[model samples]
Structure formats: C-alpha cells, structure tokens
Target chain A: ADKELKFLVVDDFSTMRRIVRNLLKELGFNNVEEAEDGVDALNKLQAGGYGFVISDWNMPNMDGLELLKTIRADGAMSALPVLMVTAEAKKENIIAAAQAGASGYVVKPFTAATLEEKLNKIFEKLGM
Target chain B: PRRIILSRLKAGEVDLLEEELGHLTTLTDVVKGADSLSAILPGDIAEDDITAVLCFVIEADQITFET
Candidate 1:
C-alpha cells in the first residue's frame, strides 16, 4: 500500500469523521482530508490528487451512492476507488453499490480490524 | 397493521410521522425478540429509517452480527 496515497473521508457526523480520521492515522495514513457530505466530498475529489475515498451513505445534498456513480461517470476520476462505510447494510444496498462501481462496502459500527481487512482486500483486488 | 407504519415511515413520512409520536411510545412490535434483529435488520430494515432499532440494540447491549 502506498503511504502517500491521499484519502478523502466523508461523513455527516463529526464524531464518525473523527473516528475514521483517527483510524486512518492509526493505519499510518496521514495524507487524509475530511468532507461533511457527498457534496463536499465531490468538491474535494475534483480538486485532484485523491487516490482513495472513504464515504458514508445517507448524507445531505448527495449520498455516497450518488458520489460513486458520479465518480464512475467522470472520465478523469472514473477509476478512482470509492469505499462505502455506512450503516445501510441491506443486501440491496450492497448490490446497488456494486452496480454503482464501488470499490468496497463496509457496514458501520465496524471494528478497526474489519476496516483494515476491507482496505487490504480493496488494495489487493485493485493492485493499489 | 404495525408493518404499515414502518412502510409509511420508509415511504418518506419520517418527519411528519415522527413529529406525531413521542420518544417513549412504542412505534412497532416488529422487534419483539432477539431473532427479530436478523429477521428485520440488514434486510427489510434500513438504518436511515429506523434510528430506534439501533438505539434499542445499543441501549439493551444486544449483540448484532454481520456477514
């Protein structure tokens, strides 16, 4: 994994954003930024140099699913990996994310170990 | 009967319906047992729709498993 990979963490809640930021830091990822929602996330992503995205669903303006679709639709950031870390854990939600070209999906209330495993899985699958 | 309320809530009346109800009032009888978690959650249940479901689990210290 590239330690220099810049990550965008998107969530509506301040607590959840802080939690993910601390977890990313614990995983030795310091090049990370925060977004309040999918709208802010897209704004940050368009600014460039973001290699990975960790976003929550059910946010204001735009949700993570919409963000994933927009990223996939874009020619420049089409291949940019977007990981969904959300509380929406239905099978349909997972299928929708996969259909929208999500790099990975993880349910909320997740452990650090689970986060690590998912990230590794994504990296391994994408050769990131 | 009770399922209709859940469906109505999910159908986008969350704000309107929630405004009519009190916090301590029981909204539905779906989550009456431990098995109900698996029955309703990560399936017919959505996190955005049923905030009380998670609140109940957290408050009761009930374990929620995942795949």
Candidate 2:
C-alpha cells in the first residue's frame, strides 16, 4: 500500500488473465505480468521481484497448488504473497490452500470490489 | 494408452455421472496440452487435479448482503 506493485497474474485462460490484468490496473497496479499456467508462473517467479501473485487453481502444466508449494518451499521468494483466483469454492479446498501457505483465495466470477477487498486484506496482513 | 469405450450405456448424458465425466475430460485435456503431463500429474485424483465447482447464490446478482 505504501508503494506501487509489480504483480504476476497466472491463469490458463487468456480471458481470465486479461480480466485480472484489467482488475489490477483498476486497483492502481499498473506493473503486471501474465503467465499461461503454474509452470510458466514458477519460471517467471524464479527471476524474482514479484510483489504479489494472482493465479487460477486450474491450469495445464502445473496447477495453482503446485505453484504455491514451489513458492513456499523455495529458499528465495519463500514469503511471496499468492492469492488464488479461482472457482474452487469448496470449504475443503479453502482449508487446504490456507494450510499450503496461500496468502488468500478469491473464487472466480468475482467482481472488481471483491478483488479489491482481497488485495486490501493481503496488503493489511502483510503490512505491504 | 488404450482408450476405453463404454460398450453399454444410456444414449443420453447421465447427470449422475456428470462429475466423473467432467473430471475425466479435464484430466484428458490437461494431459493433452502439456509436453510432459505424466511428470506433472503423477497420480489419481490426488494428483495434479484442478477441480472447479460453481454454485449460484440467491443474492449473487445483488450487490448488497442482508443478514
């Protein structure tokens, strides 16, 4: 919240990626990159300097869960804030993600306001 | 891999089997799109399965929530 952000948006669907990009821009985050899937996301993440990650749970190569695990296990970027942008709304999935070091989860078909609230929650929690 | 065709079944789509069929279709798509899907999705449902289930709420269209 103190400074501008560099966000990484990951999703298999091009439409969803564009949607997230637009949402982030509306939220005043102009610096953002897109990845096709979890594997692609991890590759980008290895380069580092990502303020936050907005990803979908369902993807081709590696899913969002694997991406979260990789981010958490890595020596670098271990503390990255990953917000799962998905449609997996089951309580079990929610609990599993929370336990897997996800900063937050946002079910898809979400509005701009819902996204803003989630980002704000992360910002407040991480003191970003 | 040998594709299994169900020789005997109803002509129409079965709603009860919708979940299973969807899951199988997704798994197939995921495997097809990747260069090495075998390495990624290494197991059954416990493997790299991305399940997305959607539900409609009564007030989903309405912006306000009333308790």
Candidate 3:
C-alpha cells in the first residue's frame, strides 16, 4: 500500500476528525488534514494534494454522501479514494455510499484495525 | 432531528435510545444509567449543546477521548 498518501478527514466537529486522524496516525499514515465540513473539505480538495478522504456521514447540508457524489462526479478527482464514517448500523446509508462510488466505509467507534481493514480493501481494489 | 431526540428523551424512550446508542457507539457508559442527556452531560454543558452532546456520545470510544 502507498502509505504516504495525504488524507483529508471531514466531520462537523473537530473532535470527530481528530479521532479519525489519530487512527490514521496509529496505522502509520501522517499526512492528515482536518476539515470542518464537506464544503471545507471540497475547498481543500480543489487545492490539490489530498489522496484520501474519510468523512463523518451525519453532517446536515452537503454531507459525506453529497461530498462523495461531488468527488465521484469530478473527472480529475473521481478516482481518489474515499471512505465514509457512520454511527448508524442501518444499511441504507452505507448502501447509498457504495452506489455513489465510495471506496469504502467504517462505523464510528471503529478501531485502528477496522480503518486499516477498509483502507487495505480499498487499496487492493484500486491496485494501490 | 434534535427535537425528535428531545421528544424521545422526554417520553421515557430510554430503551430505544439506548439500543440505538449501543449500535452507534462502544461508549454506551456515557448514557448508561441515564434517561436524559443532561443527566449524563457535564454541568457546564448548555442545553443548546444537545448537538454537541450527540457528537460526543457518538464519537466517544473505548479508546482515549483524550489528547
């Protein structure tokens, strides 16, 4: 796997982003940046340099799903790896993320291993 | 919605909320014995911080909630 890829974490709270950031750090990836919301992430995404994204799915407007759709719609950024975070155990949203081209997802309270698992699965699919 | 959550909270819907919480987080102890978010919340946390409280509850983990 390419361990040096830059990551952007999006959540409504900095606290949530930091949580995900720490997991990525623990997994030995450190080029991490935090975004307060989808718009913030999209702004930084447009600036270039992000190789991955993990977003909390509960944001109000322009949520993780919306952000994923936007990224998937962009030809230049379409193939960038993106994973979603959720608190719900329900399948609707995860199914939605899958349909929208999300690389994968992790539930909240996810362990470093779970994040790593999803990341590795994505990397395998992407031929990283 | 927060209002619906509030409605659920005030309606003695602890079991449902707790069930949902268990699925949503490993930090079920945050609201373990309490029916209301305020009871589990820190005293200084304002009522307006309901959303923040949900964020905290959802994100708190078996791992460190610390720096």
**Candidates 1 onward: DockQ, in order:** 0.02, 0.02, 0.03
The single-chain TM-score for chain B of candidate 1 is: 0.21
Q: List the candidates' TM-scores in order.
A: 0.59, 0.58, 0.57
Provide the global lDDT of candidate 2 against the true structure. 0.53
lDDT of 3 by residue, A28-83 (tens): 76766777777777777778887777676756557777777787887877766676
Q: Candidate 1 residues A24-113, lDDT tens each?
A: 667776676777877777777777777777776667877887777787888877777777776754444554665566665566665666
Which regions in candidate 1 have their CA more than 4 angstroms from the true location? B1-67
Per-residue C-alpha lDDT of model 2 across residues A31-112, encoded as one tens digit per residue: 6677777777777777777767777677777788777787778778667777777675454465466556666666666576
Consecutive 10-residue window with the lowest summed lDDT within model 2 chain A:
A89-98
Task: Mark the regions of model 2 whose C-alpha exceeds 4 Å error after superposition.
Answer: B1-67
Q: lDDT tens string, model 2, B1-67?
A: 3222222222122221232234333324223211222112212332122221111100112111122
Maximum-DockQ candidate: 3
Which candidate wins on TM-score? 1
TM-score of chain B of 3: 0.30
